[PDB]
Paper text:
A common type of LCC in hardwood is the ester-LCC formed between α-1,2-linked 4-O-methyl-d-glucuronoyl moieties of acetylated glucuronoxylan and γ-alcohols in lignin. It was recently discovered that an insoluble hardwood lignin-preparation (LRP) is amenable to enzymatic hydrolysis by a glucuronoyl esterase (GE, EC 3.1.1.B11) releasing aldouronic acids. WT CuGE has a modular architecture with a N-terminal carbohydrate-binding module 1 (CBM1) domain connected to the catalytic domain by a proline-rich linker region. The overall fold of the catalytic domain of CuGE features a large ten-stranded twisted β-sheet flanked by α-helical elements and a surface-exposed active site. The structure complies with the characteristics of a serine esterase belonging to the α/β-hydrolase superfamily.
To enable structural and functional studies two different variants were constructed, ΔWT, comprises residues 78–458 lacking the carbohydrate-binding domain (CBM1), and ΔS270A an inactive variant of ΔWT where the catalytic serine is replaced with an alanine. For the structural studies, WT and ΔS270A were enzymatically deglycosylated to obtain homogeneous samples, named dWT and dΔS270A, respectively. The structure of the inactive truncated variant, apo-dΔS270A was determined to 1.46 Å resolution. Nevertheless, molecule A and B superimpose well with an RMSD of 0.32 Å for 359 aligned Cα atoms (apo-dΔS270A). In apo-dΔS270A Y366 adopts a unique conformation in molecule B (pH 7.5–8) that seems to be incompatible with substrate binding, but identifies Y366 as a structurally flexible element. The inactive variant ΔS270A is destabilized by ca 3 °C compared to variants with an intact catalytic triad, implying that some stabilizing interactions have been lost, but the overall conclusion is that CuGE is a highly stable enzyme with Ti’s in the range of 72.2–75.8 °C for all variants. The high-resolution structure of the catalytic domain (dΔS270A) obtained from the crystal structure determinations (described in detail later) matched the solution structure.
Residue numbers in the entry: 73 to 458
The structure:
Amino acid sequence: EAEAEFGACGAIASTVPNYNNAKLPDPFTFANGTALRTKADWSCRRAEISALIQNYEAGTLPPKPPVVTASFSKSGNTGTLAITAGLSNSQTIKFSPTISYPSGTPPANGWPLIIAYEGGSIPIPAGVATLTYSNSDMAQQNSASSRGQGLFYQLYGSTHSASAMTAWVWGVSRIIDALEMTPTAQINTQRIGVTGCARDGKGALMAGAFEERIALTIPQESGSGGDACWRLSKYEIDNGNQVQDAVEIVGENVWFSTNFNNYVQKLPTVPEDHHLLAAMVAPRAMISFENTDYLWLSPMSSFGCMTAAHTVWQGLGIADSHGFAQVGGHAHCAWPSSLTPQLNAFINRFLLDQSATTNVFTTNNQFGKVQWNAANWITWTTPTLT
Ligand SMILES: *[C@@H]1O[C@H](CO)[C@@H](O)[C@H](O)[C@H]1NC(C)=O
């Protein structure tokens, strides 16, 4: 409704004041009760999901500011992309991510690139350039003490509602803006991925969800606040698994908005969960990786959450653009070589344009004191969006 004022998607909701659902919110029904039926409907539902996530847990994601400039220099195989961002009131900040390049002549359209939060913890293939993004500089993340601290807040103000992870997303968007105006960086901006591990994996998921120029999203062992769902993690903690959950996470750090504190004890009233956050990547590609050795990561919650999110790609007819691999037997953020084929399949297909098959959806079902029962959490029937 009200398309003449708001555009093609009309008056998307940012709140649902009467919501109360202990199971997972339905991806395929808008807040107003309209059912999704077409693939185009997904674009508008994703916009509504973005507004709901910002309202309840992420804070405000500012749009591109009126000043974004960039200069590039290179020494050896290392480029430095010096970025400046500024507001209409003259306030400016600067940050300078570095890029590690393969040697020699690039492909005609430039190197594919993975934006790696704090360098990431995945093996990046030799034909893909790596941009090291210091997300902690953009928004600090030591503990609850870090609230409102970081370069982002030196631009927008320390009381700005963006969570640290939303601030990190904004920084990624500026990096891509910079790359698109800097041909000498020799990056194929149509083949950019994002990755990070642990808290930086929560960050990478947020980046892929909210920044649509990311072609491939790779969250690694992101746990609670990442590819796990709040409702499922509450079920785990109530049944004796020592998981991270919504209540603890908001006291531990600043990855979520202060407003989320008002909902962590009332999760059924939140008209979203992280299955909808992950689904915001669709129709682009994502594979996330989880580790069952650490109950803190909430293993069942990630499997159930990603199974729920997967229904969006299934409804869009592109199930193989979304992968999930969950295994045990390795240290946190250590990369197990047994998963390298799955990682490379997604990188090869979505960043390197190879005909790799990307049907990856596997778990060992090692969930501790709980089991996954899809009927207790997913109530919707996946439509075939037209
Ligand atoms: C319900 O909301 C969606 C998203 O704003 C919109 O596209 C749709 O037109 C709305 N339904 C009606 C009947 O206005």
